[PDB]
Each structure stands twice: as structure tokens, then as C-alpha cells.
Design an enzyme around this catalytic site. Structure first.
Site, PDB file in Angstrom:
ATOM      1  N   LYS B 163     -28.601   6.678 -46.554  1.00 27.42           N
ATOM      2  CA  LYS B 163     -27.362   7.222 -46.022  1.00 27.42           C
ATOM      3  C   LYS B 163     -26.765   8.104 -47.081  1.00 27.42           C
ATOM      4  O   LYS B 163     -26.692   7.724 -48.241  1.00 27.42           O
ATOM      5  CB  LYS B 163     -26.359   6.123 -45.668  1.00 27.42           C
ATOM      6  CG  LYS B 163     -25.203   6.590 -44.787  1.00 27.42           C
ATOM      7  CD  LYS B 163     -25.651   6.916 -43.362  1.00 27.42           C
ATOM      8  CE  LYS B 163     -24.668   7.840 -42.662  1.00 27.42           C
ATOM      9  NZ  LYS B 163     -25.169   8.344 -41.350  1.00 27.42           N
ATOM     10  N   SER B 233     -29.899  10.077 -43.290  1.00 33.87           N
ATOM     11  CA  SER B 233     -28.815  10.210 -42.333  1.00 33.87           C
ATOM     12  C   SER B 233     -27.523  10.501 -43.111  1.00 33.87           C
ATOM     13  O   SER B 233     -27.140   9.741 -43.994  1.00 33.87           O
ATOM     14  CB  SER B 233     -28.674   8.914 -41.531  1.00 33.87           C
ATOM     15  OG  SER B 233     -27.672   9.019 -40.534  1.00 33.87           O
ATOM     16  N   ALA B 234     -26.872  11.611 -42.787  1.00 32.08           N
ATOM     17  CA  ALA B 234     -25.628  11.999 -43.435  1.00 32.08           C
ATOM     18  C   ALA B 234     -24.415  11.491 -42.684  1.00 32.08           C
ATOM     19  O   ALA B 234     -24.468  11.190 -41.484  1.00 32.08           O
ATOM     20  CB  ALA B 234     -25.561  13.509 -43.561  1.00 32.08           C
ATOM     21  N   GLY B 355     -41.606  17.424 -37.115  1.00 33.95           N
ATOM     22  CA  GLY B 355     -41.860  16.021 -36.857  1.00 33.95           C
ATOM     23  C   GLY B 355     -41.069  15.154 -37.812  1.00 33.95           C
ATOM     24  O   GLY B 355     -40.197  15.625 -38.543  1.00 33.95           O
TER      25      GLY B 355
HETATM   26  N1  AX2 Z   1     -28.947  10.966 -36.461  1.00 33.61           N
HETATM   27  C1  AX2 Z   1     -28.008  11.195 -37.406  1.00 33.61           C
HETATM   28  N2  AX2 Z   1     -26.878  10.506 -37.297  1.00 33.61           N
HETATM   29  C2  AX2 Z   1     -25.990  10.756 -38.247  1.00 33.61           C
HETATM   30  N3  AX2 Z   1     -24.830  10.045 -38.147  1.00 33.61           N
HETATM   31  N4  AX2 Z   1     -26.153  11.616 -39.260  1.00 33.61           N
HETATM   32  C3  AX2 Z   1     -27.330  12.253 -39.259  1.00 33.61           C
HETATM   33  N5  AX2 Z   1     -27.557  13.160 -40.273  1.00 33.61           N
HETATM   34  N6  AX2 Z   1     -28.301  12.077 -38.354  1.00 33.61           N
HETATM   35 MG    MG Z   2     -39.717  16.950 -40.889  1.00 33.97          MG
END
Ligand code: AX2
Ligand code: MG
Ligand code: AX2
Ligand code: AX2
Ligand code: AX2
Ligand code: MG
Ligand code: MG
Ligand code: MG
Lengths: 364, 364, 364, 364
Positions: B163, B233-234, B355
Site C-alpha cells: 500500500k 495499491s495507492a 497484464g
Molecule cells: N485497485 C486500486 N485500488 C486503490 N484503492 N488504489 C489503487 N491504486 N488501485
Molecule cells: Mg503490468
């Protein structure tokens, strides 16, 4: 370069609607061959995937093509179509039609009157968008447009509208295949870069910004660099820049005048009132002397408007330009009495950061 | 480092819903003090202004805080909360809860079983996001997480969730006031840079990419650089990176296993079935042996999927990550039989370009 | 009614792109005068303010108008244009062109082959949309289209595509001024009602639903009422219904066949495989015998897909039809190998609730 | 019923931010136990899936719960939290905090001053939303709130804020399983029906609409029925109605006053200035005597604003309420000098059709 300019604001019920224009032609109010530019507001989203801009252009061209017995493609070389999508809030879809005839004999009215000139640049390579080539080509076209308008000096120049390209994944791939990185890989952001470089091109041609400071990496960074005359609008429907220069000339006999100003920020209705007034409009009953208003709006890039935080640049559902047009469209509507005005979003290097240039066209 | 890992997929009726977790606690199925990580899918937009991630974290922390008699903020230091917003299409909001207890002695049984370790980096400055500092800090945290998991080697590592932060206008203004340019000025794009740098950090720690090639200018440019294990995931809810490393250990006694693969593109259901089948699962009634699937998805940056153009990167109403999650969520759902799976969007330097890596957790 | 039908799937690079069609004409592969219908997927949002549908129609008509020396408006009476906007996820913008010549002598192939007929209804009043008049007029046009196709019986009917109108505030005001309430005052919801009434019109004509049950207040309420053949698509570009009936006839000599099925839900790829197979397609290498797939998709109106909650009907940023197309477009793509397929959203009274009919066209 | 009311407008950096409130408590400016209502503007989308409303409530309640040593759920019974999402354009997220203490004896001074009372209804069944039960329950709660405020008569009533529920697919399924049709099956539209019925409830209690005309079939149909005092806001975070009545009382000793008016339409800044001026405020430096402005805004349902067509009701990307808030937020901002004002969208039976009531709170 002694012209008579006519300007008509015509409603659209949809992007393809040319009925307001058919009516002007069918009633002898305008001659198809004299039309040199159309500036439209179409009800697409005004961002990347807005094909309402191209659709409006295509129909207008087909409409004019019939009367002139030309192919649409040929009309698009003869007439500058600048379609700015995004009619959020109270903004009402419409076209502003510009017609030009040789000066109505002589007949020199007492003062300067509305004139207008157009120019085009070459197609840009994807890797050139947002960069020096786009700046310099734009500067050049501004000057030619000025000449074509018969605008003696910068002082008589009141508005420079530019239509410019944007990046798609295919264009990005094409740049990459020549070993060149595009200015961004985000298609939405590409619009800002294209607008910005174009605006700086105008600032170069107007000597509002010294040539020395116009390096690529200043585009979208240096908020202090700007033209107070530039109105730029990006679009997926073209690979070149289209430039319309509007101003005042002693050689023009138009029953119309133009003045310009700047909004210090998105809600600066005052400036609009002030500039309107500077053309002798002194009630709400005299407002109908205004043919239209043309304005740039943007989300303040510091993330604040008059000390208060805004969410226009943090909203991933609704892009900042859409918010900005809604806001400024409202501000202006509250002044002129309705939302059938030209408001364009993304005012990078156009007027102050957070604000934007605007112009007003009125009966003499 | 001898653990027993439990994993529970629990539905959420809304982002603040902790009822599924209260039920596990009430029914003796899990002990609050053993929970070390929660990976959630919350029904905000998954982009910049998605506060469903922070809301879910806040409530889970408050729920656990009650039982442990801790302040929420303290729980957030003890438990790795990774909330990925954006549950488009058939994606069903849920949490995957991870609990860790001292290794069982009355069993193991034989071979490697699911293990898990967590790590945190320091807070990053706005100007560090998308850049070398974020890469190197992430690499470090991956190692520590490995150690904390008891993962013998890279070969036993199956999934690295990270994260990471993103840029807001305020953060951008802060970086600017120190004379530093942020990696981008677009908040949405910042998410990609943050995910990308973090992914490259994982690739560094896994020796999947030589340190020499990880320069700032390669982030979001060089699609050949990638980790086949990285899931980034950001989020607006944190300034640091949270790292969860999942793999297999001989010291673990979990009744669970993990396998991983890569989707060659967004609709590569085949790979998912192929990796599922590599765990002896081959009919839709064995499927309930899967606890969950965790997958990265992205809009192919060449603008094509299997030779056909897509519009995911040109759509200014719906961002590419939202499309991508919908697509891959669907592809996976068609295989496992439903959409309660972890799919995250934006797979920059994660698996192949277009991908993304994925992993499957199943009963032994 | 002894026809030879030709079908061509042609890519579009944008809504106005007719280049794939110019190429077919310019290379003698199709004769302009034989074209009777075009079913397109255009990259607008597929909802109310999607003018990409009208733009594509306008250009196709202009393109065909040149070759036939007709006015575009006249071409639109001769050719059934059905443009379904919304190409989310992997969906690739394209047109499916249908051409019809008198039966290629005799020459009766061994079995039934692809045939196609078209019909139109009158313009509907705003207050008639979603209601009995729209149902009965549609039923009538289906029958005429069947006749025009030379479809002996219901059993030989495989697909009925209908294009239908939607409500705007002006249309709503017009209904109100005659003392009539429109079926809804929400323009988005009007699309569902228009699709639904039209679908029930098809169900009436096919005797899939007894006339007695088709009362206005059953439209969008009674999920049990449906046609397993109906594909309805609403649009702002027309006030009437356009109907295309596709099926099989002994009198047709087309080198093509059609079969149909139903998806039980949005991710029911199985049914698609099953129906494809029922036309002798037995690998991924034989897939290129499929000319195209045409499918309906919708957000399950109970708010659940295979037991798990979905957010498609609770998302105020992205409308349910957009989610649904993304999902089903993905499911189908995973089967046929790409996203250049016709997927339309909003399957009210079309197949099962949450699912939708589809058809496949293949080489004989 | 002798009170001293304090009102504080406090900025929020995010929906969960309670720091502005912690600061008021820490600095002795307000006592936690005196707070009776918070009206917030949170930066979610203001529609169905906006959980920023619930998140803000939850944190405020937890913040107050700490100081009062109460459970959050108990605080929510003691304090009326009304969170209106949607801060488009220049609207700046914030809370208006209302505190109520025993009337001061060392002053009053003379005449009526700001007072405030709160009431709650029972939870509604899904099938009751938008209908008679919601109307009559609301009317009742308005009266009680009046009493609780100490408002002598209707004439002293200046603003009635109501928070109300909305429909989700689950609620719709629940109503259906009891054989009852919900007022609509579209979750977005449900918000309008809930706001509308609630508004009519206020109109009933204020005798602004005779009881006889308030039939279910008139809700969202009869635009002539309205309260010029009603401000309704729907939300997914509650099943009941929350009512805050604000007005003027001789028994109140607040250093504050309230005045109200109606905007004839979304851009009617004039009315706002006119009502502001009716409090002796007439220059942008006196403006800081205003604590806040509270306003209703809506897309004109005839689809026109001052004779010109708008696209707010035809835009399937951006819902009409989002446009409307942007527009009216801008109009008001241009008057008071910034966008930290309470603007709520959807003004069905609230003020004139296309317009909406507003109120201003200012220092005495
Ligand atoms: N799928 C996804 N969800 C969040 N919250 N942030 C990012 N970068 N991707
Ligand atoms: Mg990729
Ligand atoms: N079409 C369009 N493009 C831009 N850049 N700005 C606006 N207002 N419209
Ligand atoms: N244009 C369009 N209209 C509908 N109703 N459905 C789809 N898929 N597209
Ligand atoms: N949250 C919210 N709900 C409504 N109905 N209106 C507004 N402005 N906000
Ligand atoms: Mg500017
Ligand atoms: Mg259906
Ligand atoms: Mg109203």
C-alpha cells in the site's frame, strides 16, 4: 485587409444541429461563402473522448458544403472550426458564427471596429505536443492570423483562440516507436500540456513572455508565464493547431466591437462586469447588445480558491475542467442573464493561475 | 518464526461494516490479538478521492481497539490495513482477514504451508513519491517482511502486497514550496507512479530487476522492468508504504497454501484456471477450497488488447483502473463462480505490461 | 424473399470512421445498394448524452449517400442504422454491416441459411415511451421484419434487435403540456423503460408472453416476462423504433448461419461456449469462423450475482449499464479471444433477470 | 426554552477530519455537551454511494464520544448529524457546528435571536420512502423541533433542514418480498422522492400546502406544491428522518440572527444579495459577519434556465444534483467571496421549481 465582420450566436438543440445556421442562410442574413470561423460549445464532456466536437464540425462543414458545392473536407480548410466541448451547469450548447466581407465601402466609421483573422499550423507529431515545436508553430500562426485580420499592433488584439491536439495511446505508441517519449502518458493531462504550450505560443507572439523563458520543462510548471489574451482548447479531432485572432481595426466597418479582460479567479464576476461596462452597457436591459462572451476557466492549481480548499483537482469522477466550466459558466451567467456563453476549461498559462482571459463582443 | 496462519474472507455490506468480523470474534473462530493484516476491497472509486479505504480502516481499527482496549491509531501500528477501493462490475466488497498464532505442535503437517509477514516504511515526502527513495525504502521493507514471515528464499515468496501514497494538491504545493517538483502534478497519475516505484522496489528486493536499471526516469517508462510478484495499491489515507509478504514456509502449520501466476493480459482467464488447476482444483464444487484470489489488472498501455483497440485510456469519464478492475474482476469471476475476489487496478511494473500478477489461497 | 446475406465486422478508430466501409466498397467486396442494416458499437457512454451514436449514423449515411447519390436522410430510411454506444472495458468500437442480394440463383444449399429483415415503427409521443403503444407498435414491426426476412416461423427466428427512443426534459415538458405524465421523469431510467417496453413488444410478437399480461405497470416490474430473442438499445437520436430480425431460411443462400442462446447472468461465459459449439466450432483456431457475437448484459436487479452483492446499481458515478457491458464484454472476450463484439446493456425483459439473450453469426 | 445558540463554521481537510472541532473544544470556545447539531458538507459525490457522509458522522460522534465518555451510537441520538455530500466546483468541505446552552441572563438583548430545535422520526420501511407516511411523520417532527427550539410561530421559522433515507437494491428487494412496490426502482431517483416527500412534510406542518393536496401521486409531479423553508438531503446512512428547525425566538440570547429567502433559479445570486442586504450587509468586508449560508439548488426540471436549454438532466456521466450544486455554489461564492457554504442539491417541492430556499446566519 478592410473587412466587414458579422457575428451570430445560434442555439443548438444537439451537437449535430445546424438548423440555426440553415435559418440564417435561408433568410439571407448570412452568405455561406463569407463564413470564415465557427466557435462552438458542444455538450460532450470536453475532455479526451468527446466526439461531439468532431460531429458538430462535420455537420457544419456538410451544411456549408452543400451551399458552396464543396466537399466537407474542403470547407474545413476554408473555415476555422473550433469546437469546445463541455457544457456543464447552466452552459447552453451553441455556435458563434463569424462572417467576413470586404469593407462595406468607405464609410470608415468614427473608430476602430471588430476584425478577425485565421491561421493554421502543420500537423504535430505526438512527441511535439506540449513542447517547443508546438509553441513556435503557434507563435507563427498567431502572427499570420493577426496579418490576415489586419491588426496593426498588439494593442488592437483582444482575443486569440487556439484549437489544439491531444494524445491517445496510439499516438503515444507512435512516438515511442521513434525512440521519443511523449510529454505525458496520461491522455487527460496531455490536454493541459497542449493547451499550455499553445498558450505560451500566443504569449511569445504577443511579446507577453520573453522567448528565453519558454523551455519545455516550463510548460505546466511556471504559472507566472502567461498570455492575458490566450484561449486554448484541446481536442481529439485534429493533429494541427487552429488559430483565430480577434481584435479592432480602423479598416473594419463592422457594427461590432470587442474588449477583453482577465478573471483573477473562477468566480471573478466583477471583472466581467467591469469589462462589459467599459463598452457602455449600463443595465440588464442593455445586455442584449452583447453578442457573446468568451472565457477561460480553470481549477486553481494551488488547490484553493480565496483561501478555501477546493476538490476540483482531487475528484477522480469529475475532471477539474468540468468543475471549472460549471463554476465560471455560472458566474458569467449571473452577470449576462443566461448560460449561452463560450466558457472553456483549462487555462494553463492563460491569464493568472486559477483565472483566465475573457473577451466580450457587442454591437457598436 | 513458527506460525499458524488463518485466512478469512468476509463480506461487507458497506465500507464501515465490521459485522462479519464481529461474528468471527464472537464465534471463537479468530482471536483479535492474532490478527496481523486485513486486505480489503471497498466500494469507493479506488482513485484519489476514495475515502472508503480510510473509513474501512478506521472502523476495523475501532472494532479491534475495543477488544484489545487499544486506541485505533495503535491498532494501525500493530495490524497492516491495506484497503483497495474500486469494486466495479461484479466485484463484491469484502475483507480478507489474516491471523497469525504460534505454530501448532499437534500437526504441520508436511512440506511448506502458508506464511505471512508485514513491514512498514517511513513516511515519504511528496517529492519522493514515484522516485528512488520510494523504491529503495520499499525494497528494504520487503526483506523485513520476508524475515517476519519466515520465508527462506525468493522461491518461497508468492505475493507481495504494497500500500502506497499518492499526491494531493496540498502535497504538491508543499513540495513546490521547497523548490522540488513532484513526479507529476496530476493526482490520478501520481497513483501510477507510486504503485510503479513501489513495484520496482519489490523487483529490486526479489533480484528480478538489477539495481543498476532502477533510475527515476525509468519509472512508468520502461515496461520491461517488472516484478511478477508485486501487487501495489495507492491511497490517500497514508504517507508511508505498508508491505505484506505472503509465501510458503516449512515452519508454518497453516491448513492453507498459496500459488501464484501472471495474467498476460486483462482477459487472461486461462492463466488463472491454469494456476488454480496446479493446486488440484478442476470443477466448480472443488472451487470452495479457494479462500480468495488476489489479482492485478490494468489497461494495456499500448491501447490494444489482442490486436483490438480499447478505450480504457481515452475515457475521461471513467479512469482506466476502474475499467481494468471491472474487466479482470469479470474474467476471474467467470472462473471461480463469483466476484468476491481481490482485484486491484494499475499494474505498472507488475507482471507484463497490460497484464498483472495474481495469487490464489486455498485449503491444503 | 430469397436472399443472399453478407455480413462484415469492420473496426472503427473513432465514431465517425467510415474507412473500413470505404475499403469494402472500393475493393468490390460489397455493393452500397445492397446494404440494408448496420449494427454498431460506438465509444460514447451508451446512455442519454451519447451523440456518438448519431454521429456514426450520420457519417455512414453520408458515405453511402455519396455512392448512391442520395441525401443522408434518404439513406436512413433505406438502411437500418442501430448504433449502440458504450464500449467499456475491452469492448472495441466497430460496425457490423449487413448486405442483402436476391438469392444467388438455385443453388439451394443443403440446409437453412442466414436471413435478415428490417422494419420501422412510427415516431412515438413522449408519453408513449415505456408504455402499451410502444409495445404494440414494436410487435407489429417485428412481424413485418420477419416477413421481410422470409422467416417461416418463430423457430427460425434467432435474434431481434430493436433501437428505441428515450426521454429528454423537452420531451417530458411536451408530454406534460398535453396533460399526460411520462413513464418516468429521469432520463436515464427512461432508457430502461423504452428498452423494456420494446422487448415486451418482441415477446408479444413471438408469443413468448401472453398479450393479457402486458399491462403498462408490468414494464420494469415483472422480471418473469421476457423474450429470449430480444435485444433492445435506446438512443437520443430517434423518436421511432428500428427493428432488425435475424434468422434462418431455406430460401437463403448465405454462406452464414446464426444460432442464439441466453446468458443466465453477466458472467455466464459457459452458455456462450455452448452455443458457439452448437455451430461446429471446436478450438481457438476455428474461432475465426465467427463473424461476430451480439449480446445483452445487465446489472442483476436483485443487487446480487451468484450470491454476492454487486454495486452496479448503487454507483452514482458509473451507471449500471456501463458496468454491465464491461463485465459481459470481458466474459465474451475471454471466449472468442478479443473484445470486438456487440455487447449492449440493459436487458430488461430480455432473457432472464440479470442475464440476457445473445446470438452468434458464423461461416456456414 | 430559553437558549444561547453558538454557531461555528469549521473547515475539513477530509471527511474524517475532526481537528477543527478538537480545536474549538481545546480552546474553551465550545463545550462538547452543548453541541446539539452538526450540518456538514463532505466531499463524496452527494448521491447514493457517498459514504463520506457516514464517515464524517462516525468520526464526529467518536470525537464527541471520547469527551462525553459515550458510545458513538449514543452521541448520534443526542446530536443531530446532517451530512450533505457533494462539494463540486468551489464548494469547500466543512461542518457547521451548533451548540445550545441555557439562555444568558447578563444579556439578550432585545428582540428575537437565533434559536434551534431538533427532532427525529421513526425508521421508515423501504416502501414508505417518497410516500404519505414519510410526509406525515416529517410534519410531526417539524412541530416537535419547533417546540424544542422555542419557536412561537411559523413566522419566526426561517429554515427547516431534513435528512432523509434513500433506496438501495437490498431495500428494494425487501419491499418487493413483502409484495410492495417501492416508489421507484432507481436508487438515484429515490433520493428525489425522499427529499420531496420530506419537503412536503415541512410544507404540511407550516400550512404552506393544504393537507388535502398531499397525495402520493403528487410527489415529484406537482411542482406548484412547495415549502419556501424546506431543505431536504437524502443519504444512505440512515433509515429515519432527522429534522433541524432554525429560527428566531425572544427567549434566545444568541449573538446571531437568521434571515431567509428563495432563489428563483440556480443562478439567482441577486436574491442572495438582496437577503444579505436585508441584514445590513453591503460590502465584502462586512461579509465576515456572515457565519454561513445554507442553500438548496436544483436542475430546472423544464430543462431550461432563463429560456436557454441546460444539459444537467441529460448528462449520464454527472447527475443533475452535482451540476446544480456546482452552479449555485459558484453563484453564492461570487457574492460572499468564497465557497465554504452549505449548498445542497435536489430542491423538489422546495422553493420554486428550478429554484430553492436559502438562509443566512449572521452576527447580530
Ligand atoms: N485497485 C486500486 N485500488 C486503490 N484503492 N488504489 C489503487 N491504486 N488501485
Ligand atoms: Mg503490468
Ligand atoms: N473540448 C474542450 N477542450 C478543452 N481543452 N477545453 C474545453 N473547455 N473544451
Ligand atoms: N446506446 C446504448 N443504449 C443502450 N440502451 N444500451 C447500450 N448498450 N447502448
Ligand atoms: N448528500 C446529499 N444528498 C442530497 N440529496 N443532496 C445533497 N446535496 N447531498
Ligand atoms: Mg490561467
Ligand atoms: Mg434480462
Ligand atoms: Mg424547487
Amino acid at each position: 485587409h478592410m473587412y466587414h465582420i458579422d457575428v451570430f450566436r445560434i442555439p443548438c438543440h444537439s451537437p449535430g444541429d445546424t438548423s440555426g445556421l440553415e435559418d440564417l442562410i435561408e433568410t439571407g442574413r448570412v452568405a455561406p461563402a463569407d463564413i470564415v470561423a465557427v466557435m462552438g460549445k458542444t455538450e460532450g464532456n470536453g475532455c479526451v473522448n468527446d466526439y461531439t466536437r468532431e460531429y458538430a464540425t462535420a455537420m457544419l462543414a456538410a451544411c456549408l458544403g452543400r451551399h458552396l458545392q464543396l466537399p466537407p473536407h474542403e470547407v474545413e480548410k476554408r473555415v476555422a472550426f473550433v469546437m469546445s466541448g463541455g457544457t456543464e451547469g447552466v452552459l447552453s450548447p451553441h455556435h458563434t458564427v463569424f462572417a467576413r466581407r470586404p469593407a462595406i465601402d468607405a464609410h470608415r466609421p468614427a473608430g476602430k471596429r471588430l476584425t478577425l483573422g485565421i491561421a493554421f499550423t502543420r500537423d504535430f507529431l505526438p512527441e511535439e505536443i506540449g513542447r517547443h515545436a508546438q509553441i513556435t508553430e503557434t507563435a507563427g500562426a498567431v502572427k499570420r492570423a493577426m496579418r490576415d485580420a489586419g491588426i496593426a499592433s498588439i494593442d488592437d488584439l483582444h482575443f486569440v483562440q487556439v484549437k489544439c491536439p491531444l494524445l491517445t495511446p496510439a499516438k503515444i505508441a507512435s512516438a515511442r516507436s521513434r525512440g521519443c517519449a511523449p510529454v505525458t502518458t496520461d491522455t487527460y493531462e496531455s490536454m493541459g500540456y497542449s493547451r499550455g504550450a499553445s498558450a505560451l505560443g500566443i504569449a511569445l507572439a504577443t511579446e507577453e513572455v520573453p522567448s528565453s523563458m519558454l523551455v519545455d520543462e516550463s510548460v505546466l510548471n511556471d504559472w507566472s508565464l502567461s498570455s492575458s489574451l490566450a484561449s486554448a482548447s484541446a481536442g481529439i479531432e485534429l493533429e494541427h493547431n487552429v488559430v483565430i485572432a480577434i481584435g479592432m481595426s480602423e479598416q473594419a466597418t463592422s457594427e461590432l466591437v470587442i474588449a477583453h479582460g482577465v478573471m483573477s479567479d473562477a468566480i471573478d464576476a466583477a471583472s466581467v462586469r467591469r469589462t462589459i461596462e467599459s463598452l457602455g452597457i449600463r443595465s440588464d436591459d442593455e445586455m442584449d447588445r452583447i453578442v457573446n462572451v468568451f472565457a477561460k476557466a480553470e481549477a486553481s492549481p494551488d488547490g484553493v480558491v480565496r483561501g478555501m480548499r477546493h476538490t476540483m483537482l482531487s475528484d477522480s469522477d469529475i475532471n477539474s475542467t468540468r468543475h471549472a466550466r460549471a463554476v465560471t459558466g455560472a458566474a458569467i451567467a449571473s452577470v449576462v442573464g443566461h448560460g449561452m456563453v463560450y466558457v472553456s476549461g483549462g487555462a494553463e498559462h492563460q491569464g493568472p493561475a486559477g483565472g483566465g482571459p475573457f473577451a466580450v463582443i457587442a454591437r457598436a
